[PDB]
Amino acid sequence: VNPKAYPLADAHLTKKLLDLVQQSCNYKQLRKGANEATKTLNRGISEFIVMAADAEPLEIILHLPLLCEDKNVPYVFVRSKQALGRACGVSRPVIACSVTIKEGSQLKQQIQSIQQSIERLLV
Amino acid sequence: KKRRKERQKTAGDGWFGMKAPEMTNELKNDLKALKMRASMDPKRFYKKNDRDGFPKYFQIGTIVDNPADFYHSRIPKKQRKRTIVEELLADSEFRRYNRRKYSEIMAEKAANAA
């Protein structure tokens, strides 16, 4: 494991993460791609960021943790871009995705639970 | 007395020594325009002015260009002017609205007086 991909989720947390990513897609609440994930951070509408640790150059997504630390947005890494591709409903690999803030959403309880699970990884 | 007079020329150390500019008819015209910004646009509304008079210490400048805002926020160099008043003299939208309002006021002024 590259030491720069520090918050690496375990098998249990990954399953919860990919479940919520699929649900967020059905609620029209998911932005897919590194460039689109960057824009949600600039606009302050991001709940959390999920990235793929198996990008062959890992540096192409390392700008996202810098942006999150300024906006105070949690972020994690998963082991597969192909698995992250299916969870986003895309027929291609995805190395970064963003869950968007939506007022009155029914996913607020699940998003809040996942956010606290992320923050415990950072002690 | 020289101590009291020398201090009053400058805003002080609290604002890094901003100086009071010499007041001219071109500077006074700009400050009067800024005070009456509420009536420039019928669809824009503003808060009340901070002070009835003009500020004692102030400076005049222009907004520097940024490469990232080439299309988002930048005025072409032909549209740029030297003073705030000349900017108001150039734009068509303000001139069209202002003359319509000014005509209506003088219409009722003649209508009332007669």
Binding site: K4, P57, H63 | A68, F70
Partner: protein, 396 residues
Amino acid sequence: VLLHVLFEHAVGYALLALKEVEEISLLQPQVEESVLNLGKFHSIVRLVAFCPFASSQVALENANAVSEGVVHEDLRLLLETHLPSKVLLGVGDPKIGAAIQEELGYNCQTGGVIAEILRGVRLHFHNLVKGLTDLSACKAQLGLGHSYSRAKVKFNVNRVDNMIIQSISLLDQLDKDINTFSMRVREWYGYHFPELVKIINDNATYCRLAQFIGNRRELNEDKLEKLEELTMDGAKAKAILDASRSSMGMDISAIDLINIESFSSRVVSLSEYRQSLHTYLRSKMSQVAPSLSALIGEAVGARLIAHAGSLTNLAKYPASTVQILGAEKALFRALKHSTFIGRAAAKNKGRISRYLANKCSIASRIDCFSEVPTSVFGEKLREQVEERLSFYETGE
């Protein structure tokens, strides 16, 4: 309440003795002046020993030791020498207190009046150690704060983009100054030989020929053969002599010829430095951003970083905004500047520019966040641009 306190500073270790203090009422409005007022503080606190750090490296070693809570050799040297051997020692850290108590038999305390005395020492420290150290206390803290932070993050001084930003601004300044001076050189010699400005179309070529002939009075026989060698064609060299024989310009004095010669040599040497600065920028871009320089060139790559303001700022931008950074000067639109094999039609000029901008965004991130910069990725991205160019040009 006679006790000793250990105070750690960026300049060195300080050992102090406390005579007496009103412990129970210390945090009360009238009694608190015992530590707040310098005159009252001197009456109850004395400096018994002081050991400054010899160098910045020595200070950094002691700073790391204090943070970890271990006793450095320099600290133990001070404590063993100047403490009698039933002793109370006040320390700011409980962990360093236990370590000292293991190394030496002193009793270490962190609670009680000790914490309030240490605020008095920290407030009045510059007065107590005044003149004992050559390096000032305020400058020492600024210096150690940087060196401590560099060690934690493993900062690399080589991969810094300050100079490339300075070089780009200075290169544009040099171009304006060289162009302005060459026009004035051309005008001064235009007074003497106004025919010459018409024949020669290059500023650099003109200064060479102006250097070659000081006066039009002496340009003949063996000189024209030399003139034939400087000029691209022999026909023009013959015409220059005929122009020199019958010219509308005035004659120049001896002192006027010295002035124009020294001014011309100044412009030439100024151009030589502008070439060396371009070479220095090329080497700097190789160390900092080899992949970005390989993709688009050192000249365009350095200008992209200058527009963003930093290399990290370039990497943080999305791909769409990177294209806008080159919009004014047409860095992506004007392709020969960056040179690529093959050409793009006017129809696909917009598509190629957008595709090239996306690759440059990726290359900037690779250079910025790699442990060791390498230009292999830049060459791979360049190969993809050539493939996309040939895709449009041939149709497959």
